[PDB]
Design a protein around this ligand. Structure first.
Ligand SMILES: Cc1cc(-c2nc3ccccc3n2CC2CCOCC2)cn(C)c1=O
Length: 113
């Protein structure tokens, strides 16, 4: 219930942007947990030990799980890293990850301090 810190307000803003229609053309693979069984990716959980996605990040922010911006950023980067680990580098989903990570990194760099 307590107010997010100033840095976590900035993080929440970024999160809102990543989930916004503005970026939907490349963000949509990251909206929800990878459903490995549904997608036929029966090796996914053998390869990715720590799944992460934007819905999970949103829930953690709402629940005040993140104690600082660094913790938030680690989860967003984990999400991208998982994509880069599992998928061949020339896959369309990787191109989408790179584009969304560019959005993330450039706005994260504008953190107040
Ligand atoms: C391996 C993998 C799959 C998906 C994924 N989530 C989907 C949801 C609904 C429908 C399809 C979904 N996919 C696979 C798509 C295959 C084509 O490129 C976009 C993702 C997302 N990410 C980040 C991955 O690393």
């Amino acid at each position: 219930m307590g107010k997010l810190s100033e840095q976590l307000k900035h993080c929440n803003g970024i999160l809102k942007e990543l989930l916004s229609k503005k970026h939907a053309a490349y963000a949509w693979p990251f909206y929800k947990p990878v459903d490995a069984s549904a997608l036929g990716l029966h090796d996914y959980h053998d390869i990715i030990k720590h799944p992460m996605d934007l819905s999970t990040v949103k829930r953690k922010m709402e629940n005040r799980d993140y104690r600082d911006a660094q913790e938030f950023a680690a989860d967003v980067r984990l999400m991208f890293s998982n994509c880069y680990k599992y998928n061949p580098p020339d896959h369309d989903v990787v191109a989408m990850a790179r584009k969304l990570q560019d959005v993330f990194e450039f706005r994260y760099a504008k953190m107040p301090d």
